[PDB]
Design a binder for this molecule. Structure first.
Ligand code: RW4
Length: 835
């Protein structure tokens, strides 16, 4: 039975656990046991929560960032149901009470308090409970805007408890620092050099040193000594040694990095063999500090770590043993001349006292290649007041490589609400890539939070699982997933069911790719349907939680509605229905295989954020942040938005449609008039107008380029949205400066199909201005989030030039005033550009 579990984990994570063992490694071996402990105790806590608490773990509320309402309620065993009039201001308890009083009369009354129940959304993994107005609940909202009547089910507490039950599991060393560079094993055309250097973060702890010029063979021999311009007793606990190997007459060949203190803080010695990574300013301090696992093909560099006695980096305990100014004027870019830094350092007790939020600026002027300077910084750190989340996020960057610091950030991040934490999860994962060691505060934090909230849990898994084909993080992520599963047996089973669907989806897609190159779509579609109709398909692809959103259930797959697009990577359109969920169960997914959805996922998340900030301030721009999740190697899912189309498509202005325009510009409006007759039209134009304003501003600020009519969509409701985001930050395909954009087809619709409507247009103008100004108030939030993502190795997000795009598009350089004028400048341009 333990064997079975183990083998299912292996299948889930996509890498056998025997591959962990066979490395014979203390770091790994300790990670696995210590974490297993951690996670299982979390299982223990969970399996004894109160029923409500369980609900919060297992189906977290989905909330919003008056008038009368129709609701249909039913109880768990019967199909008999009741349809109340309720108030959107009513608490769920009120509704439950009504449902009880209705139960008690039909079924003549005993009768059992409302506080025993929770309302489940029919045919979804969603519930409604807690002291909230009914329309604070996302699902309730959905229905309101879209006409529909809420279908809920009274679930008694003991039913929930049955659920909970079924899911049970030294400064003494002054000499300079030297290594020996012996030899290697590898390929090129000339002469070979290695250069070395010591980094603490992006910072060099002294001048790098080079190798002497050796002939271009395959098994080079230096046997060199290499002494660095720092004392040994100075090295900071996080000192990072970096090499680059290249040829010369420059040809980069490979790189390699390691920590100088092992993970139990022992200064390392003596011999290391270094299995290097292929080669893409040659030095790469950010890159993984574990070696290439391709040990039969990686160039290897043997080095030697001299002995100097054993020596353990000091305990904190020891570390801790060791004018009327203008400093404010300097305290507001953040790059600064030398005297300026010396000031900060001198003033550092004042910064802790009267500018606690300047921690970061101080960490950067602090002298990490001087142990003394480090101990006082730390001294100060140990009594430093906690920081707001936004400063914490700043601290997570590569620039702050020290563990004590790392830990203080987590210490500030702990007050994250589950909803905020979810908003940043993508970033906190990509950051694991910077970790020096396996066992770390962050991982523990992520594991702890995942284990306490099944949705964090769900998405952590997929973020991790989607990078398994990436050698440099295969080991770390595989280990984290493993831990996670030890903490959740039942979830592991739910997630396997998802991997299986994915798997078949991959098989089905490959067959589609083949069949299509030997026949007509119609023919291929009928084949697709047949292969789907096989039991093993029918069964694998049905009854699962959607990896795009676990609260959506994909019940029965409607084969007659499935298809593929005949072009490119042949994506799959797979549709579901569910008797239980009624209309709400009619959902679809799109399976893409051959593209990289990572950058789309990032963009749509910045758009989701943008919406939340706008909403937090009372502006709902009617955005469509649809689900998009990479799940494997150039593989992932995209949520289907029903009742929508592409602009381009509506503009094929095909005869014998409702939309038959005499002039092409009418096409778009014709279509809305057909989807929104008589009185309904006014609504749709308004929707169109708000969504258009959001996407105008989000695409501008993000530098989303390559925008055709075939990657912009409208919903029958009026809402316009952008899809397919493959180039951003001006990086259209090299790097331009996309203007604000404004299609004339849209200005037509905003103005209700009239040539002048300054009235309607100048509203629109305001929307834009507003959406724009709010974003700016959270400029840093974007800056810090985009900074953390430089870790993903997204090729359109590599460097300084990339994030620059944002500072500018947001003009965080200018003031509340001059930003807005400057904005209007590029708005009227875009305007007069509309022919
Ligand atoms: C026929 N109508 C409705 C179905 N339709 C589509 N059928 C497809 C069949 C197989 C594969 C993809 C299809 C895409 C569409 C149009 N379309 N494209 C998308 C879409 C959305 C996002 C997205 N991101 C990428 N990187 S590619 C991509 C494609 C889409 C969506 N999310 N929801 C609903 N319809 C969508 C075109 C217009």
């Amino acid at each position: 039975v333990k064997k079975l579990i183990n083998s299912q984990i292996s299948l889930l994570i996509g890498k056998g656990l025997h591959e962990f063992d066979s490395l014979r490694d203390p770091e790994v071996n300790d990670f696995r046991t210590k974490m297993r402990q951690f996670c299982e105790e979390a299982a223990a806590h969970r399996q004894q929560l109160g029923w409500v608490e369980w609900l919060q773990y297992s189906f977290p509320l989905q909330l919003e960032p008056n008038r009368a309402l129709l609701v249909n309620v039913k109880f768990e065993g019967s199909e008999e149901s009741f349809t109340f009039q309720v108030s959107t201001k009513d608490m769920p308890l009120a509704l439950m009470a009504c449902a009880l009083r209705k139960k008690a009369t039909v079924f003549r009354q005993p009768l059992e308090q409302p506080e025993e129940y929770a309302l489940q959304v029919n045919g979804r993994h969603e519930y409604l409970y807690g002291n909230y107005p009914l329309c604070h609940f996302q699902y309730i909202c959905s229905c309101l805007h879209s006409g529909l009547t809420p279908h809920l089910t009274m679930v008694h507490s003991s039913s929930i408890l049955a659920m909970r039950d079924e899911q049970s599991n030294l400064w003494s060393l002054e000499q300079p620092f030297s290594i020996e560079l012996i030899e290697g094993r590898k390929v090129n055309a000339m002469k070979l050099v290695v250069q070395a250097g010591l980094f603490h973060g992006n910072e060099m702890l002294c001048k790098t040193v080079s190798s002497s010029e050796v002939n271009v063979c395959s098994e080079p021999v230096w046997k060199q000594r290499l002494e660095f311009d720092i004392s040994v007793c100075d090295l900071p606990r996080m000192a990072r040694l970096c090499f680059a190997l290249y040829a010369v007459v420059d040809c980069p060949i490979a790189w390699a990095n390691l920590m100088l203190f092992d993970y139990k803080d022992q200064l390392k010695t003596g011999e290391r063999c270094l299995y290097m990574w292929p080669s893409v300013e040659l030095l790469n301090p950010a890159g993984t500090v574990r070696g290439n696992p391709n040990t039969e093909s990686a160039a290897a560099l043997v080095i030697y770590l001299p002995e100097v006695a054993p020596v353990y980096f000091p305990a904190l305990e020891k570390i801790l043993e060791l004018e009327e100014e203008l400093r404010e004027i300097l305290e507001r870019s953040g790059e600064l001349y030398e005297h300026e830094k010396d000031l900060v350092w001198k003033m550092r007790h004042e910064v802790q006292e009267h500018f606690p939020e300047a921690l970061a600026r101080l960490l950067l002027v602090t002298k990490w290649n001087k142990h003394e300077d480090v101990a006082q910084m730390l001294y100060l750190l140990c009594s430093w007041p906690e920081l707001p989340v936004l400063s914490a996020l700043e601290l997570l960057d590569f620039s702050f490589p020290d563990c004590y610091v790392g830990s203080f950030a987590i210490k500030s991040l702990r007050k994250l609400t589950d909803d905020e934490l979810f908003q940043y999860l993508l970033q906190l994962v990509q950051v694991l890539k910077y970790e020096s060691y396996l066992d770390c505060e962050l991982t523990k934090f992520l594991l702890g939070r995942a284990l306490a909230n099944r949705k964090i849990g769900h998405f952590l898994f997929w973020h991790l699982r989607s990078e398994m084909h990436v050698p440099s993080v295969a080991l770390r992520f595989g280990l984290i997933m493993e831990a996670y599963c030890r903490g959740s047996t039942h979830h592991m089973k739910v997630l396997m069911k998802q991997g299986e669907a994915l798997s078949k989806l991959k098989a089905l897609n490959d067959f589609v790719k083949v069949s299509s190159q030997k026949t007509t779509k119609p023919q291929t579609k009928e084949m697709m349907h047949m292969c789907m109709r096989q039991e093993t398909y029918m069964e694998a692809l049905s009854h699962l939680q959607s990896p795009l959103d676990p609260s959506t259930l994909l019940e029965e797959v409607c084969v007659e509605q499935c298809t593929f697009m005949d072009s490119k990577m042949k994506p799959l359109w797979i549709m579901y229905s569910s008797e239980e969920a009624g209309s709400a169960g009619n959902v679809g997914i799109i399976f893409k295989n051959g593209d990289d959805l990572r950058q789309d996922m990032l963009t749509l998340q910045m758009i989701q954020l943008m919406d939340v900030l706008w909403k937090q301030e009372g502006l709902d721009l009617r955005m469509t942040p649809y689900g998009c999740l990479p799940t494997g190697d150039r593989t992932g899912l995209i949520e289907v938005v029903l009742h929508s189309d592409t602009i381009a498509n509506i503009q094929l202005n095909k005869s014998n449609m409702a939309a038959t325009a005499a002039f092409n510009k009418d096409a778009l409006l014709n279509w809305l008039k057909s989807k929104n007759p008589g009185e309904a039209l006014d609504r749709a134009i308004e929707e169109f107008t708000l969504s258009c304003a959001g996407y105008c501003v989000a695409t501008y600020v993000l530098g989303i380029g390559d925008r055709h009519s075939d990657n912009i969509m409208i919903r029958e409701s009026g809402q316009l949205f952008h899809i397919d985001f493959g180039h951003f930050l001006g990086n259209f395909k090299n790097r331009e400066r996309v203007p604000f954009i404004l299609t004339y087809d849209f200005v037509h619709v905003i103005q209700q199909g009239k040539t002048n409507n300054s009235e309607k247009f100048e509203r629109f103008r305001g929307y834009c201005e507003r959406a724009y100004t709010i974003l700016r108030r959270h400029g840093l939030l974007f800056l810090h989030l985009f900074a953390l993502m430089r870790a993903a190795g997204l090729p359109e997000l590599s460097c300084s030039k990339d994030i620059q795009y944002l500072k500018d598009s947001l003009a965080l350089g200018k003031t509340e005033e001059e930003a807005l004028k400057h904005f209007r400048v590029k708005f009227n341009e875009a305007l007069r550009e509309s022919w």
